[PDB]
Amino acid sequence: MISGSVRFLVNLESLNGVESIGNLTKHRTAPVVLKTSTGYLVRYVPVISGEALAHAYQASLVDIAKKEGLPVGSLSSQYEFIKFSTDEALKIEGIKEPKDYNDARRFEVEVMLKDVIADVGGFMYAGGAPVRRTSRIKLGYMIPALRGDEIPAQLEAQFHVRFSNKPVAIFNVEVSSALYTFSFELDEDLIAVPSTFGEKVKGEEELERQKAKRVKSAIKALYSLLSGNFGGKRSRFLPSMKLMSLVVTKTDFPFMPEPAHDDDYIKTTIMRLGKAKGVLNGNLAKAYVINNEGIEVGEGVTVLSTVEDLVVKLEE
Amino acid sequence: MISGSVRFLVNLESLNGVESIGNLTKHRTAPVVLKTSTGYLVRYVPVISGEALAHAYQASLVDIAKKEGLPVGSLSSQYEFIKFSTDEALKIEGIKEPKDYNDARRFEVEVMLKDVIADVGGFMYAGGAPVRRTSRIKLGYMIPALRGDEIPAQLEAQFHVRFSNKPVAIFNVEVSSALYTFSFELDEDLIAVPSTFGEKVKGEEELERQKAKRVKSAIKALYSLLSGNFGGKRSRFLPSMKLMSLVVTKTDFPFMPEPAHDDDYIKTTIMRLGKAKGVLNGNLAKAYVINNEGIEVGEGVTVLSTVEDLVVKLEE
Amino acid sequence: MISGSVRFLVNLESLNGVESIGNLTKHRTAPVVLKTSTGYLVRYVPVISGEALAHAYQASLVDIAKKEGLPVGSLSSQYEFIKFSTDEALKIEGIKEPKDYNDARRFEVEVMLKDVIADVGGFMYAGGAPVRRTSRIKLGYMIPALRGDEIPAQLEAQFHVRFSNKPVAIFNVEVSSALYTFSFELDEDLIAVPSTFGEKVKGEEELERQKAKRVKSAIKALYSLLSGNFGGKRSRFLPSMKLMSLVVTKTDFPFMPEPAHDDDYIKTTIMRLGKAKGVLNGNLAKAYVINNEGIEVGEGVTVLSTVEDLVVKLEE
DNA sequence: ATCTGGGGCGGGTTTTCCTCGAA
RNA sequence: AUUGAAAGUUCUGUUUCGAAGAAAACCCGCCUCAGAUU
């Protein structure tokens, strides 16, 4: 299990919308409960959805899987991620539907061989015999840091025109700036492993053979999100990202580091790691820290220089 | 017993749900009566049910029990907590239904030797000779702090789209952010102890042999609930939790600490505990406290640093 | 005597139920006539029967009596309060039925030496020679405050499901919130005193040797009701209680303070007690008050911080 | 400080289960 | 002060035990506030 927390800094940005009113495009905003000296307050703040990062991760995964020779589905060959939700996707792909519960495992394995994305990202098929498979990577919204008494985020509107020579052409676009943060989780101890209960079926040998390649590709995929390649409306509103602080941890037991809200969240997670290992009887716990803002770190933890090093270390 | 109150601060989550209408998901909400500066009011507020916590705790218990070698049932090997209620579960597990009341103790012991969950989580079998075993852990809904006049909570809806290349795929999801608090109860003096009244039957010696391990595992299992690992929709809506304040108490007599609504429930509960012992003539009464929001505590009480230390000390 | 009236604030609660319909579990309800500024309205409101409170009190009494060293019956040691109604209870307990009227008194003594519960709570025996004994503690339903024209109380349904892997399991439960109130009476000058008229019988001396202990235990047993331990469905719906106002009166003459339906029920009851002492030729009268909602009280009263102090002073 | 432009379109959810028993 | 006068149908009892609405998905593909002035 690889878990992590990341702090980005974004200026003059619009990477997600919700709808439009009149001739105005709306950024995504949501409530937050914040703590200050006086007490508890409710504020509205711009956020970036969690399904605008899963899409980027899955796209990078598809690209790398195609480049390295691993199988990739038909619909997912194009960047459409209906996977196998409905009967039409199955018919196009070329798989048969489950007959009864006993056969369910069979079907899954087939689906889990044709398309890599349906394996690391989970899926759901609804029919007379439904089948489910939860994701192997988990994500959440991207909120700015709820630190201190002043949220360091701003939102505004801008006025734009479309030139013409025969007037008979004006639009307003929302733009935001923030100190974003988020956290992520990936469990590599279940990749290429059926999640349904039943007797053994043929074809699992190929899965056992491909497990190493699949895990390596999935780990490599995270470089997309960690680098800052995601979101929409990038053509004319390319943002200016920058990495401030990152903490990642590899363990054998469930564990989640502190959110990036407080200035001192590197130290607390490191301190808690060893005690968690002791209480839960673990056998491996390592932590990697990337720091550029100059805050408290701790002791007995690696210090890297760039994200590219972390991917290599995780692969090793 | 071990009884405690906990205060949480969650942002932008959707943990519990209920039936949906149209293309919109629903977050569990309930009515609450609140005291104001002008009287008493009825409000509607989001709430996280009390059985999601039970499922998370029992899943953690299953994991640790299987890790440490304690017996675990067959159906409960998978996470299907029907337990020995319906006849099909007994038939799968291989136990004969009781004949008369005189056989109740035999059935209870035989079931309790096969499944730790059916022991530390109670169970019920309905039939000609009904058998009951009340839970040894007790939990309730998770309500936001009913303090003052302004409830610190907020619930909104969000817009999501499933992109495609051949339009012919839109949904809305509710998202909340609140300051959650809840209380929990447990009793270690009844684990590995048959409840029904009868004559000693063989095998209870083994029950007495494993009591220490069962109690240790049950105490360890709480770390899952205390660390923030529960609820659904965690794949794409991973919350951002944080622990503000916590009080836990180990005693020898019935005792329920003050809810975490008012600002000062630590000093009040410690003062009440100081006198309850003398009132009921106990012999052990210890209190542990974690304080991050800087509220009134008292003097001469333990001040821990995390939840791992609390679990370690409770184990000792 | 000791009389009292108490006010509670309960949220997200289900402590009493009745016959169910379909997959719906119901909360007990009853009619109430409320006088509003427009007239006399009739409403339906959730109520909790008094026998639940009686059962909780008697269970606490059994626990304390066993722990202190007073006699306790055979069946009642297992928390089954049939007392001595039917012949089977006598046969298990090992006592002889009365023959005729003149012998009845003897019966009442023996049963009153073998079980403190049959002493405090009374009993009945249908048969040739009835032996009645009115309870020494009296309680009534728990109705929410009828202050004003807007009753603070709400009753809703909630939806729950049982997970399974092979569908072939859905239930609904009623949850409530309200501001409850209830009143209680307990005359301590009739404990350990035969209540049937006849000649003296041996063993009454032993009864008189334990009167102090029996009375003290009966007083201590009220800590349960005054702390908030009663009802059912406490395993998964642990309610969040809190005490707001309480009035207790210790006297030598019949008295019944004001029902806690009006914001000013403390001053009125204090004045009524003051005048009743004079009118009834009484000799002792004291009033204790616990006040947490900051309402008007009066002058010349004792204010207690918690229930522990109240029980201590009642015992002293 | 004088004008003129002030948005267009495709999509607006699919499944599985709807209470067991003692009085 | 009347078919009136004289009377309690009263005592004893839990609806209790257990069960995740969970799994899958991008609001996104195009546009300039431009021309003249001490």
Side-chain angles (χ1 to χ4, degrees):
Chain A
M1 289 193 75
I2 303 161
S3 294
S5 308
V6 184
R7 177 185 273 175
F8 284 119
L9 171 56
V10 187
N11 308 146
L12 273 65
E13 184 274 330
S14 163
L15 290 155
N16 202 359
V18 188
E19 293 182 354
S20 309
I21 284 161
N23 70 337
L24 173 71
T25 62
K26 304 213 85 179
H27 206 287
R28 185 155 283 181
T29 59
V32 290
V33 169
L34 189 149
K35 175 156 191 296
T36 58
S37 81
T38 71
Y40 289 121
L41 308 156
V42 176
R43 289 270 182 72
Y44 283 73
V45 177
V47 309
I48 295 160
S49 84
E51 310 213 325
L53 309 175
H55 197 91
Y57 175 74
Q58 282 173 351
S60 278
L61 170 57
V62 163
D63 286 334
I64 286 167
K66 271 175 75 174
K67 177 161 136 193
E68 272 206 3
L70 284 152
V72 174
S74 174
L75 275 168
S76 81
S77 308
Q78 294 84 18
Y79 302 87
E80 173 168 348
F81 294 138
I82 190 171
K83 287 162 185 179
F84 300 76
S85 189
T86 73
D87 201 36
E88 304 301 323
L90 270 70
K91 197 175 168 185
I92 284 154
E93 297 275 7
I95 309 174
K96 326 306 185 193
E97 68 193 6
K99 306 179 185 180
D100 315 300
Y101 297 104
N102 298 265
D103 200 68
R105 180 139 188 164
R106 187 269 300 162
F107 164 67
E108 182 178 350
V109 175
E110 203 172 2
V111 168
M112 185 176 176
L113 277 170
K114 206 165 282 194
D115 200 17
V116 161
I117 305 310
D119 174 22
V120 180
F123 72 87
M124 186 211 88
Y125 167 87
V131 163
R132 313 156 166 76
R133 176 177 176 81
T134 180
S135 172
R136 306 275 181 271
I137 178 157
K138 311 194 167 181
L139 288 149
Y141 279 178
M142 202 187 293
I143 304 164
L146 310 182
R147 172 184 48 69
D149 292 6
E150 318 193 350
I151 301 171
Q154 192 68 71
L155 184 64
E156 194 161 358
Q158 302 277 11
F159 168 93
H160 287 288
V161 184
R162 155 159 74 179
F163 175 88
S164 172
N165 286 116
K166 297 213 171 208
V168 175
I170 277 168
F171 58 110
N172 282 313
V173 168
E174 281 196 43
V175 168
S176 180
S177 311
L179 171 70
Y180 279 116
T181 69
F182 79 106
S183 59
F184 69 90
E185 178 181 0
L186 173 76
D187 57 341
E188 69 271 13
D189 292 314
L190 278 150
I191 282 163
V193 160
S195 188
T196 313
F197 308 98
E199 315 189 356
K200 271 178 189 173
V201 176
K202 180 60 63 139
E204 302 179 20
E205 298 192 356
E206 193 66 23
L207 273 154
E208 295 169 352
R209 295 164 198 173
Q210 287 161 353
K211 185 172 290 203
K213 269 185 204 172
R214 265 164 198 248
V215 166
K216 203 178 150 63
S217 295
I219 292 152
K220 261 189 194 169
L222 280 178
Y223 177 52
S224 80
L225 294 188
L226 292 186
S227 168
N229 266 298
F230 51 86
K233 301 195 208 208
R234 289 168 63 71
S235 50
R236 301 287 182 276
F237 298 121
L238 186 83
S240 172
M241 295 213 166
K242 178 155 161 49
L243 193 77
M244 305 301 276
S245 289
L246 173 144
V247 179
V248 177
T249 317
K250 186 163 159 166
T251 74
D252 293 332
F253 46 91
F255 178 88
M256 304 157 292
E258 298 289 354
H261 297 176
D262 305 332
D263 279 330
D264 296 331
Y265 73 116
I266 297 161
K267 192 191 306 202
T268 294
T269 178
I270 289 163
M271 277 291 286
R272 265 168 71 236
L273 195 54
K275 302 179 180 171
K277 160 170 175 168
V279 62
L280 271 161
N281 297 132
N283 302 104
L284 168 61
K286 291 182 163 72
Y288 318 87
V289 167
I290 311 181
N291 187 358
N292 310 321
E293 51 173 26
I295 53 163
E296 296 297 327
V297 188
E299 298 183 355
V301 175
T302 310
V303 168
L304 302 169
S305 281
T306 81
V307 175
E308 297 89 351
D309 293 331
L310 183 80
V311 178
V312 176
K313 290 248 178 183
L314 295 156
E315 282 177 50
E316 282 171 0
Chain B
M1 270 160 51
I2 299 169
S3 304
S5 294
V6 194
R7 173 177 281 177
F8 272 126
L9 180 62
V10 184
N11 290 131
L12 281 71
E13 82 294 352
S14 168
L15 297 170
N16 216 42
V18 70
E19 284 193 340
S20 301
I21 305 169
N23 74 338
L24 167 66
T25 73
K26 302 290 283 296
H27 192 307
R28 185 79 67 79
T29 50
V32 299
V33 176
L34 180 137
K35 166 150 204 312
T36 49
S37 49
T38 71
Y40 293 93
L41 306 167
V42 186
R43 295 271 170 75
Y44 289 74
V45 189
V47 299
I48 293 161
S49 70
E51 305 201 353
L53 311 195
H55 199 103
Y57 175 79
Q58 272 159 322
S60 278
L61 170 60
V62 164
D63 270 319
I64 291 169
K66 250 162 74 178
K67 178 146 171 175
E68 269 190 357
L70 306 157
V72 175
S74 175
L75 282 165
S76 64
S77 313
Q78 303 100 28
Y79 309 82
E80 166 153 4
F81 297 132
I82 180 164
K83 277 177 240 180
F84 306 74
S85 172
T86 67
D87 190 33
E88 312 318 315
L90 275 65
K91 202 166 164 189
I92 285 166
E93 293 284 12
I95 291 163
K96 297 288 183 188
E97 75 188 9
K99 309 168 196 174
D100 312 324
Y101 309 110
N102 300 270
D103 201 31
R105 189 135 188 161
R106 189 267 294 161
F107 181 101
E108 171 161 32
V109 167
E110 188 173 1
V111 169
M112 194 155 143
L113 282 162
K114 214 163 182 160
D115 209 15
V116 168
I117 309 308
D119 184 18
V120 187
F123 78 85
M124 184 222 82
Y125 172 73
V131 182
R132 326 173 173 80
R133 196 202 153 66
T134 316
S135 158
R136 309 287 179 247
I137 174 158
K138 319 214 159 192
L139 299 155
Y141 279 5
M142 196 188 284
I143 306 171
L146 306 178
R147 164 171 33 69
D149 289 330
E150 314 185 348
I151 312 193
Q154 194 67 87
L155 182 79
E156 193 151 344
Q158 299 286 326
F159 178 78
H160 290 305
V161 182
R162 165 160 85 193
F163 163 83
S164 176
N165 279 123
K166 311 230 168 192
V168 177
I170 288 163
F171 54 102
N172 294 275
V173 179
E174 290 195 28
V175 191
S176 166
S177 316
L179 171 85
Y180 285 105
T181 71
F182 76 102
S183 52
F184 73 94
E185 164 180 313
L186 181 75
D187 49 0
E188 61 264 26
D189 290 313
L190 284 157
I191 290 163
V193 171
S195 173
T196 317
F197 303 101
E199 309 184 357
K200 275 176 191 171
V201 171
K202 181 60 64 143
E204 296 180 7
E205 307 174 351
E206 189 59 32
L207 268 165
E208 285 179 352
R209 267 198 217 86
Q210 295 163 350
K211 181 175 281 183
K213 271 192 195 163
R214 279 188 209 229
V215 163
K216 192 167 149 66
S217 302
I219 292 163
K220 268 188 178 176
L222 285 167
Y223 180 69
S224 84
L225 280 187
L226 287 181
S227 162
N229 273 320
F230 49 99
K233 296 209 179 204
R234 297 174 58 71
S235 62
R236 304 262 165 272
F237 295 113
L238 201 75
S240 165
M241 289 207 182
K242 176 162 145 51
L243 197 78
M244 302 308 282
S245 293
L246 175 138
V247 177
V248 164
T249 302
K250 188 178 169 143
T251 81
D252 307 331
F253 42 98
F255 183 85
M256 305 176 288
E258 271 281 344
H261 295 226
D262 305 306
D263 270 323
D264 306 339
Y265 64 103
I266 288 159
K267 191 196 295 181
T268 293
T269 189
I270 280 159
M271 292 297 288
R272 274 186 58 224
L273 183 70
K275 293 150 178 198
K277 170 183 164 171
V279 167
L280 271 170
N281 261 312
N283 306 115
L284 191 74
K286 300 186 161 175
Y288 305 103
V289 170
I290 315 165
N291 193 7
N292 304 312
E293 42 171 356
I295 53 165
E296 288 295 321
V297 160
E299 305 185 356
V301 177
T302 310
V303 168
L304 307 166
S305 300
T306 71
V307 183
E308 295 87 6
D309 314 301
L310 168 59
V311 178
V312 161
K313 291 220 176 185
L314 289 166
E315 267 179 43
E316 283 179 3
Chain C
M1 306 169 51
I2 302 162
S3 287
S5 295
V6 179
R7 183 182 267 181
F8 277 127
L9 178 71
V10 176
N11 294 137
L12 269 46
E13 176 272 326
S14 182
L15 292 159
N16 219 32
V18 72
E19 262 180 348
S20 290
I21 316 175
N23 64 344
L24 188 70
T25 53
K26 313 206 81 175
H27 204 298
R28 179 159 262 152
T29 56
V32 304
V33 166
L34 197 147
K35 188 182 186 292
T36 51
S37 64
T38 53
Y40 282 80
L41 304 167
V42 186
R43 292 283 157 80
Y44 279 70
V45 180
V47 308
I48 296 158
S49 71
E51 280 180 352
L53 306 167
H55 201 100
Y57 175 76
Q58 273 169 110
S60 281
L61 173 66
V62 160
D63 277 308
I64 279 161
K66 263 173 73 178
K67 167 159 175 175
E68 278 194 354
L70 300 151
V72 182
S74 161
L75 280 159
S76 84
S77 296
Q78 302 165 124
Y79 303 106
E80 171 172 336
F81 298 139
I82 187 170
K83 310 210 187 179
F84 306 77
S85 168
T86 66
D87 185 52
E88 306 306 333
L90 281 71
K91 189 169 176 178
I92 288 159
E93 299 280 8
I95 298 167
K96 298 289 178 189
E97 65 192 356
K99 303 176 182 71
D100 311 297
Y101 311 106
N102 290 264
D103 180 62
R105 169 137 189 158
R106 180 264 306 159
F107 191 94
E108 161 163 18
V109 188
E110 183 178 1
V111 179
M112 189 167 171
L113 273 156
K114 194 181 280 193
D115 206 19
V116 169
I117 312 312
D119 181 358
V120 162
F123 66 87
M124 185 190 93
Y125 170 87
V131 168
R132 294 155 198 164
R133 175 165 173 108
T134 300
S135 177
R136 305 271 166 282
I137 186 158
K138 319 196 167 195
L139 289 158
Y141 280 52
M142 199 191 284
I143 296 151
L146 314 173
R147 181 175 28 74
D149 298 7
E150 312 187 355
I151 309 174
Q154 198 64 70
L155 188 66
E156 193 154 0
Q158 304 290 20
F159 170 92
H160 297 294
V161 176
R162 171 153 67 176
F163 175 48
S164 180
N165 303 94
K166 296 206 180 194
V168 172
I170 287 160
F171 55 110
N172 278 310
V173 168
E174 282 196 26
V175 164
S176 171
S177 281
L179 179 73
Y180 284 115
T181 62
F182 78 106
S183 55
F184 75 88
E185 169 176 353
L186 158 70
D187 48 356
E188 86 286 16
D189 279 316
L190 290 162
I191 282 165
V193 159
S195 186
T196 315
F197 291 79
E199 301 173 353
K200 267 171 190 175
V201 174
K202 183 59 59 142
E204 268 164 17
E205 310 175 355
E206 183 55 27
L207 264 171
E208 291 169 354
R209 292 176 183 175
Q210 315 160 340
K211 195 167 282 198
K213 267 179 196 175
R214 293 199 184 198
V215 159
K216 192 172 170 65
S217 281
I219 287 167
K220 271 187 179 176
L222 281 176
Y223 184 86
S224 84
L225 280 185
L226 287 184
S227 197
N229 296 287
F230 47 91
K233 281 176 195 208
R234 288 174 68 75
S235 49
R236 302 277 173 244
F237 304 96
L238 188 69
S240 176
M241 290 211 174
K242 175 161 157 55
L243 190 81
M244 310 290 267
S245 291
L246 178 142
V247 185
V248 165
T249 316
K250 183 156 179 175
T251 81
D252 301 4
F253 43 87
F255 200 59
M256 279 189 300
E258 294 283 9
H261 287 166
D262 285 314
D263 270 328
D264 284 356
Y265 73 117
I266 293 168
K267 188 186 287 185
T268 290
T269 184
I270 279 160
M271 293 296 286
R272 286 178 75 248
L273 177 77
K275 296 179 181 179
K277 185 203 176 164
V279 70
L280 269 170
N281 270 311
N283 219 6
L284 171 64
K286 275 153 176 182
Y288 292 110
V289 160
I290 317 177
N291 177 40
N292 266 315
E293 43 171 351
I295 57 166
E296 286 290 321
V297 177
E299 304 184 357
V301 183
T302 313
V303 178
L304 304 167
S305 299
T306 66
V307 182
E308 288 82 347
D309 293 332
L310 164 60
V311 180
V312 160
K313 292 221 174 186
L314 269 162
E315 281 173 38
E316 278 174 4

